[PDB]
Amino acid sequence: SIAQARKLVEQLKMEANIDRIKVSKAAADLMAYCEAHAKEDPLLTPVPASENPFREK
Amino acid sequence: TLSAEDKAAVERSKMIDRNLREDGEKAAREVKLLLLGAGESGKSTIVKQMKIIHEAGTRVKTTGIVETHFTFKDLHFKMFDVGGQRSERKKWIHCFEGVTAIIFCVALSDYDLVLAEDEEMNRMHESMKLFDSICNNKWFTDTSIILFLNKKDLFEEKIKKSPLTICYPEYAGSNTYEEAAAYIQCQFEDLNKRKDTKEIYTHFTCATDTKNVQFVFDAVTDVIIKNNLKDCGLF
């Protein structure tokens, strides 16, 4: 099982060379996406039954 | 509401529901059995013994699951062989919850043999471990097991040549087919932790054409009768 070891180490070294951003930036980009699309989310903010396809036509 | 398209849609839905109910009623009239065992454990021999003159009550080969459909004495059986599923059992073993019985096939002649993965692992011990794992699952706590002890003649020749003490160090008895076979049958039955709920039916696979299928039929009818008795409060 030595041939697969070369492939595994190549995979790890290819994974380790990617560019990474700060976790604060990632959390901020998730917050921005959630707040920008919050008004467009029927489940988060209940929709009136007039335009609710599953309650009234 | 009163539109033609809505009426057509509801009519199609009702027709589809009728077809589904008919198909479900037809499928409920079938006894489902799960076939298990080791690799060369005589599962193929048992399956071929089932399919003699009675079967079927550009497709691509599955090789994942094989369904054997046979009818014996006006009873429809569907036997599912999952030998070709080389994967983790716990991720799909719950799909077979609700089968009438489990046909566990173990070869008596593999006690001397060992697995190819490592020398210090008997094939019979692997079969016993599989039987213990499958008999005490949280899904098969209510399901009876039909145990088949295949290769009785090969087992007799092997024990006449090689003793049973290698497979069972604690074994102490005369090297004869009857005593060794009874000991193996008792060892497999002692792995049933759910004694009060399920029953193990053991049969020694024989060359006679209809005895194995007859044993399966008797075990299945006994299971159905005992389930009815339990429902009635009489068992």
Binding site: - | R29, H76, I224, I225, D231, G233, L234, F235
Partner: protein, 286 residues
């Protein structure tokens, strides 16, 4: 005076109605409780509910007031509903016994030929027998003594009619139930009978436990049926043939009538409030 009897009959009727309605509702709104046996248990519950909401209020009003204050036509309607709904309940017990006998003795027909149509046919036959026992008195077989007393509601005393109704409502169902449950008791024992010493002892203890369980269950079913309906039908068969020298106390007659009526309250307990599936469904509802 009669307030205690009024409260006792009211609570008995309320318990019977509540139990039967609960069983019917549980079968209706539960999806696991949708098989042939539970359909028969639901039809029995419906029949007992009809007994408890159509016959029991009028019987209690008759008992409390000690006289019939509803009219001769209403008296005939009461007698007809009483015989029809109670014969249907007894024949539902018989049909449940027959279905259990078929399920235990014939696994092949249990798997293949057992369909809800069989349950519907059994219910139809039970109600048809109830009609054939309760309707013929409404059409003939009425001596003038039945309506001779305006302040009374008594069944026909004709020997032929009393034999026909009493036998075809209790004694044929009783004999059929006894035979069916004896055969079921034989089959259950046959199935129960069929270190090493420890395993053998454990198996023997298990076999005696199962034998005790089956004896207890069959005893419960048969003893409930007997103690509820046998005392009434013995009197219903003897008194018509004994015109004199067999005066019947009102207390004992009312007691044997209300034992028969309370069979409808006991039936949901025996057939629904004991098996595991119904208990699980009721707990899920609650």
């Amino acid at each position: 005076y009669q307030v205690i009897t009024s409260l006792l009959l009211g609570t008995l009727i309320f318990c019977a109605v509540l139990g039967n309605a609960c069983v019917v509702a549980a079968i209706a709104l539960e999806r696991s409780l949708q098989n042939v046996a539970n359909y028969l248990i639901g039809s029995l519950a419906v029949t007992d509910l009809m007994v408890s909401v159509l016959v029991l209020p009028m019987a209690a009003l008759y008992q409390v007031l000690n006289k019939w204050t509803l009219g001769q036509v209403t008296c005939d309607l009461f007698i007809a509903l009483d015989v029809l709904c109670c014969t249907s309940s007894i024949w539902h017990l018989c049909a449940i016994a027959l279905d259990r006998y078929w399920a235990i003795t014939d696994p092949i027909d249990y798997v293949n030929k057992r369909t809800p149509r069989r349950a519907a046919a059994l219910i139809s036959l039970t109600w048809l027998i109830g009609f054939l026992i309760s309707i013929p008195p409404m059409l003939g077989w009425r001596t003038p003594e039945d309506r001779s007393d305006p302040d009374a509601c008594t069944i026909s005393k004709d020997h032929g009619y009393t034999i026909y109704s009493t036998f075809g409502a209790f004694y044929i169902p009783l004999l059929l139930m006894l035979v069916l449950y004896g055969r079921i008791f034989r089959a259950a024992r046959f199935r129960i009978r069929k270190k090493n010493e420890r395993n053998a002892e454990a198996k023997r203890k298990m076999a005696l436990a199962r034998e005790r369980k089956t004896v207890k269950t069959l005893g419960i079913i048969m003893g409930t049926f007997i103690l509820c309906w046998l005392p009434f039908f013995i009197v219903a068969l003897v008194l018509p043939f004994c015109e004199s020298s067999c005066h019947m106390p009102t207390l004992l007659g009312a007691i044997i009538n209300w034992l028969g009526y309370s069979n409808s309250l006991l039936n949901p307990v025996i057939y629904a409030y004991f098996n595991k599936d119904f208990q699980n469904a009721f707990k899920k509802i609650i």
